[PDB]
Design a protein around this nucleic acid. Sequence first.
RNA 1: GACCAGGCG
DNA 2: AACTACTTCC
DNA 3: GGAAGTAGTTACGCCTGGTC
Lengths: 48, 65, 49, 55, 570, 72, 390, 76, 600, 48
Amino acid sequence: YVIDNNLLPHMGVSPEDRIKKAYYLGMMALKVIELSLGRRPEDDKDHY
Amino acid sequence: MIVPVRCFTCGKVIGDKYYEFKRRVEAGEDPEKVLDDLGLERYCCRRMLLSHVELIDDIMHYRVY
Amino acid sequence: EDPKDPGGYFIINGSERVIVSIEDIAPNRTLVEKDERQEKYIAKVFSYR
Amino acid sequence: FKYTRFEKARIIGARALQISMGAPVLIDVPPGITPLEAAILEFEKGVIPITVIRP
Amino acid sequence: VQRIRQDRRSGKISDVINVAYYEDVKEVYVNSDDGRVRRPLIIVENGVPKLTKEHVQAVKEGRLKWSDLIKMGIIEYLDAEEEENAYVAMWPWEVTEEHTHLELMPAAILGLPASLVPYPEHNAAPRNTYGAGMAKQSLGLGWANFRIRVDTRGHLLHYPQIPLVNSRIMKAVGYEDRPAGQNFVVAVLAYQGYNMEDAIIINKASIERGLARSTFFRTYEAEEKKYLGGQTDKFEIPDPTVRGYRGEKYYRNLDEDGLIFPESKVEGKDVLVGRTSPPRFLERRETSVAVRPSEKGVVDKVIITETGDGTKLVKVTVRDLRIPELGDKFASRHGQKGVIGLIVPQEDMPWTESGIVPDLIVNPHGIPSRMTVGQLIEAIGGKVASLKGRRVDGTAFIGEPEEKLRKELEELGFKHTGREIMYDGITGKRLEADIFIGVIYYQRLHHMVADKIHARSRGPVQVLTKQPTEGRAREGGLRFGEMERDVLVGHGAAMLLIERLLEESDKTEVWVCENCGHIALEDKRRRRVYCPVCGEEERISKVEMSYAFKLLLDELKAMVIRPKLNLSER
Amino acid sequence: KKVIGSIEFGILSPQEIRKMSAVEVTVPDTYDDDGYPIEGGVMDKRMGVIDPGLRCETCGGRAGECPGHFGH
Amino acid sequence: VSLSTIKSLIEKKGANLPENVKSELYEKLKKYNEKYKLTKAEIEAIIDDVVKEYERALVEPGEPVGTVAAQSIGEPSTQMTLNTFHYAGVAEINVTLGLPRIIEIVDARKNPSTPMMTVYLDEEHRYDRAKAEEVARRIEGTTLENLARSTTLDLINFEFIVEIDPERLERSGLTMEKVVKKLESSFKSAEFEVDGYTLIVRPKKADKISDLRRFAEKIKKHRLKGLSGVGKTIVRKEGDEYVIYTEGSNFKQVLKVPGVDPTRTRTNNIHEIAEVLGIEAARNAIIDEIVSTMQEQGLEVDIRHIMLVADMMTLDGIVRPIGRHGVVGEKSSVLARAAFEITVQHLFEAAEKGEVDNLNGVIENVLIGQPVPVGTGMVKLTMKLPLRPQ
Amino acid sequence: EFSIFDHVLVPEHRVLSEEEKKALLEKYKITLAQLPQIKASDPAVKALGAKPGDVIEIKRKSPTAGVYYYYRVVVE
Amino acid sequence: AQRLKGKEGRFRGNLSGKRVNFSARTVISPDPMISINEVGVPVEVAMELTVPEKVTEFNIERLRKMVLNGPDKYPGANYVIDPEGRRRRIMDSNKETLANQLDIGWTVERHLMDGDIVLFNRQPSLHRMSIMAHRVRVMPYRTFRLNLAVCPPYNADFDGDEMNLHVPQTEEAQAEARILMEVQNHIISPRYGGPIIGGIQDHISGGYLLTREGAYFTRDEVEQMLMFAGVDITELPEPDKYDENGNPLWSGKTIFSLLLPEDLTVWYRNKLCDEPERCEALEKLIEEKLMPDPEEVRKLAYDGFVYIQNGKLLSGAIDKKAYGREDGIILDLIVREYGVERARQFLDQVTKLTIWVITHKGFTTGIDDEDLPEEARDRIREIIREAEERVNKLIEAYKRGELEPLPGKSLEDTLESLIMAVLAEARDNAGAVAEKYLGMDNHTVIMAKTGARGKILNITQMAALLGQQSIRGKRLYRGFRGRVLSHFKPGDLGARAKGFVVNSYKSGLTPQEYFFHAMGGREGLVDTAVRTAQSGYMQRRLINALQDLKVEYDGTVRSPEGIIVQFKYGEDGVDPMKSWRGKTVDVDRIIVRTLLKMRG
Amino acid sequence: VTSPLDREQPHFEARDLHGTHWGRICPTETPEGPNCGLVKNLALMAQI
RNA sequence: GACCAGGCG
DNA sequence: AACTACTTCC
DNA sequence: GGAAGTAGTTACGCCTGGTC
Ligand SMILES: [Mg+2]
Ligand SMILES: [Zn+2]
Ligand SMILES: [Zn+2]
Ligand SMILES: [Zn+2]
């Protein structure tokens, strides 16, 4: 329940959307890794 | 609202001159020449005619009875 | 009514209520930043549904 | 003996409070004077019945 | 990305679509969501903007509309993401082949109240912020609908005026149809120290002729409430036999129906809707509606109507004429706030060799610390506009340059600096220095001293703490906070602290049992004082303490804490 | 008249609360339908009265004059 | 009038004067006697005027000095608008200044946000930059990662590769062999082979990859030289004297390294000053640090208020905060403590221990509505009854 | 070699005799509990032979009065 | 628990601070024609608030008259309380009977009248001068009035300010206020031992226009200004010059000297000292004998060296150094050597005199006050051009790796610090050129050099370049990636692209410079509120920690349980309010004063 | 336009003017006090 | 009575 | 939220 | 010694209106 509803609800709440949740989480992890390696700057929160 | 009877600064009566000034300016005459012809030489008096808004027409439509 | 009035508001129990826009963070977009405390890189997303 | 600010204030306040409850004025005062002004006149003249005690 | 934007400009793709790319990390972002703030720009290709003169002429003649220009791909909407990829030019003569967009109008980056300010780039940013914020508090004909509108409070400047130096945006928006303020003749000199410290000196003759005059509207509401069981209240002039009856003078203007006749002068505490409610004391109680204790006026309008549930409802509107007096707040569009420090007769005001008398005088000491050169430029422009008979364009960056205004003032027969030879009204000799004088658009704010003055000798108190109530509307008392307590302590004033914090808020007397320390009980029926905890009658004595401290003792005796009191002989 | 010389803080004993109280409250109600306080309720007149026209059963004082009394 | 008679008269008639006042009066009278011929009567009149003005300026008993000091410190803080300040120059050290600095000092922070020490030098190292940079090197704690030009890891062969800049090694004094010698004894079972200016580490006991990573972290974080807790060091000149400013804080270690002047070395950390030098030194450091912080912002506050605050802060033998866990928390009155911040906790704990509030303070007497024992509240009055108007 | 008393921050400390301590306590009409205290583990105390219950006179070298004597009791 | 704790709880909301009776609040307006210790009270407030006065032998007639007037007429009363404690509201069919039955021992709650003592308070209340006792002066209009010299203690600026007025009700409280809290006292700040109640802007500027070199006044002007100031005088001094028509003329220095003590003598350099050689010559003349020949001083008189001799102003011009919020030499000496009533009299007289001078002499500020010749404009233009070229060279060196880091910071920080240093130096040089070219006859310059209002930075920003804008001490960087606005090439580090505004306020800002200036103003306005909140919390902590500490009768400072905090307050026993700018005694001042008193 | 952040806290990065506000948010119109920078008004050229 | 919002210094 | 300080598991 | 948890605060007034 917390996987389907409470993790990445915008992807979906059906079990068919679990895999796309995995792809989105992998993309987020890739971004955080790139920040760890310094290949990208910090994301500004006041940037419109 | 409606044109002030007297200039706020020196008290010169400018109530009558506003409609003549408006119609002459709409006719295409030079505003400086019109204001000189009307007799308003001090710029305090010219401020009264040049910056006035006839707002009475826009509020006459609502009645209080 | 005043023809100059632009509308865009509600009348609730006789009072005029205007809804002010809220400057929220972009949904479904992940943002990366540094915690600077545990040397942990944090990437958060606000998923809306 | 030099009074401090606080001793002077207490003496004048006590004297004015006494005057407001019928204690006779120790000097001559102009008519219409408020009791506080009467006490201040009394202090400025120097006729001060109240004495401060120090440790 | 190029294909996307070319398709959008060709019209086959909707306007809402925006796309950007990032060479740094090789990512293309496409946005089609809602709530993106965007701005329009002119598309520039190969050093030539898409917009041309014939497009401008078509727009001017009404043949072409804004949506048309957006659809043809002439003007583009960009949010922050797409703007990141842009290289925007600010002026048409600055366009090069490397530029991607051209700014439609750099003066439109400001807000609407901020666009009210003329020559905003000649002012310090804090003063521009002050002026933009104070533009929303001025008095004027806000809406032509005000007469029949029912609103809790409202104002009406009797003679609004167009700003002589005004931005073109203010005419395009429609501010000219609803102006809020007047053009004053302002002299910048120090006069008797009454305009010192941002104070303002004003002309009595100008006020008496209608300058800054206004009317304040308040609408009181009274509903014939229908309680349970059919126990209704009634609109009527109550008989003196009803409970809570006010003086018979307060119902002087009422009609037999129970409503006050219109155009009848009403002063403080006079009733407008005589009303009686069913009794609930443990005769009919009174719940009539009267004007607020510090407010007077004339009854402008009385309407009667029916509520949503079907009960009768009446709205009464009272208008009070507010002629400017000492303490009323005045402001200019450049952030120069101030209150009227003095009202001077015309024969005491200085005059110019051209016969010009100021309507307002401002101390020069407020100019340099604030760095509002825009106000001086606006004064020059206002004088030039009055002399020419044409209003001066004061737009943010394309307005009339100050050099042109000075040259025009020189050609009109006046000193180019704006300084004029002035004479002292009191003594009759000309002042040694040439006085800077001009026309500045001043606006009267709704912070009137009549709406703020408050004084409370003694009145109602809160039930819980027996301390004075809070608020000007309910005879409240001013809070003597703990900061003022420390201020009093630092002065050594111990008896004044007692008088201010004990006698004048909640002084009371309590009975304390010396044997136990609890609070003794006084039986008013049996005429005895005793301690129920221990049954003592001889070791009982009064103490003097604030009612708030007795309440604190009660809340401490709750939650099971014993605050035993020890007494000393003094 | 006396002045407070010191305040000793302690924890009230059950016997202290029982003796200091003027009423034992049993009914979880405030007022009746007619508008009078319910005997045995939180607003019992033996704990003081706040509504004008009522009278206190412990002091006999009117609203605003009766200091108030404790219950358990 | 002889010059010794001047001092004789100062000691005779000015015995009721502070020592510094006597010294200043002596020096000034000497100078004015050198310039103008001062007679005996003028000298005696000057002495009488000095003593009268001193007696007139004495503080009045009952004065509420504490609240006046609190007000005179808190009020200028509203105009402490400078706050963060940046300076452009060859050698400057970052340091918190302004309102946050005053809040840090008055709150008695365990360690400031920007610890920093002022290190003076003895006569042997106070007149040449070359002789001072060596002792500054002796102070700065430098680890391998700081000295490294770059880092590199080879997990397959359990190899850790460290590229090292020759220039910063020339500016740190450590040679490559000098770098490796102590690293060898720091961690055993490692090859520690240096390849020119690119050191390589191959631990043999790192059976797992994570073991090699932990070894690399240990080697990088290990300090080769200097004193622990100390970072960047700079050198500045004043009065023909070279001094050192450090980015770290270690008072005793710095006072023990050769070449430093142990009679003038300072520290921003007040607690460390107290633990190394004593409570009086901590109080003096607090006073002068607050004075300097106020002076940097152009605000003028009297020294006496600072002295009162510092003496109240160091009254228990330790430096304690001004807030609820410090001077206020040590107040004897229960109601005074309960009025400040935490209220239910203080009342419940006071009821637990059965504390008594003797009402000897100001706050509680205000709460109850009785005279406060300050100012006019300390004046006892007496009066002879028979009054006879004139 | 280096004593903490040679530091410019540290003022000179000194232990008062019993007669001087009695005279001090009589002068201000105080008990030892009414004096400021200095910990027995304080470096200035340890540099002397002071033990808990003792009074230390400190020559503070004031900027306003030149010299100024401050007294602290030793506590555990 | 919520009933007790919290800022709205019992302790803070109803015990430490609580709402009070007999208080009033309204907008404050300036009034230079009332004394510093007086306040103008509206008739409405005076009629509303009352003072309980027990009727005695001497005030029976006045209280009878005010009972007869009743609550309607202003000099009237509201209530009458018999000795038994029964109170009766005065109304029609009661005034005559209550006036008849006034007797002695009754209480009459009368209206405020002139001379009554009240507490006046503008309540962000930081120091003890936020509340001072003022003498009531009843005024027609409905606003509080305040003398201009008393603004600095209250920090009031007549832009909508409101102040609370509390009326003490007991005779003890009235005496406490009138003795300890009156505005005559508290002229010297306890914070720094210097004058806090002094001239602010118009007093200083009018004093400079009065006492400056070549400033002369006609007989009618002199008589009018002396009468306006309240100075008592029956004969004018001998005139200094004679006009071309034979009209006598008085110097401003003589008029100013007419209101100084006849024994005062002091010398000092004020802010108007631009040529130190003349000041050194004057000091050398003075040091030889300490009583220089007045004509010899008049030969070497300078505007930057104030020299008063026996109450006669012989050289110098009135500045912020004469009297001001800080470092008022003359006011401090008058309040420390002649009393506190003399200081009040001198303050009132000098404020009125300077106000008259500045009013009838003319003081204005126009567009021409920011004008510079073509040479000054060209010099400033070359200054900015050289600064921009230097910044370009630094950027190019950093791009090629040519630049090497400064100690303590990286290459990027080294480049940033060097660029900011260059920009600040360029702004300083342009301001120096503007200062050289504008001159001392400009009214904007006059009020800035004399400290009346504004600094040199304001004139520099108004007549020359605005300078580099910055947030948190760094150059402007918040915006797009590699730039601030999308009107600059990404990766640009140039002067203009990072916030260096090259335009004056008079020249008008370009849109980019306007946005940069908006960012700077925003950072300042954001700083203000955070600073005030933090300062308020710290002040509350300090006050709650140091509330009760007091000086005992033996001279020590002791804690409530008797713990000795200080064996002598301030380690020397001198109150900072009574000290000489933090010093125990001004030894040199005393020596010079005594030597001039005897040898004179 | 309003921000959901609490007005009491010192949101230094959120109360300051951003370069992306150009043409989207008014650079000068903002209330004084606690709401400074957190309450914004739209520029006249802004389109949502 | 307490909650929210907007302002004022 | 963003700071501190304890506390308290480790 | 960590390394999390937990708790405790975060200027002072004043005004307006609107809903419970
Ligand atoms: Mg103000
Ligand atoms: Zn006119
Ligand atoms: Zn008992
Ligand atoms: Zn009862």
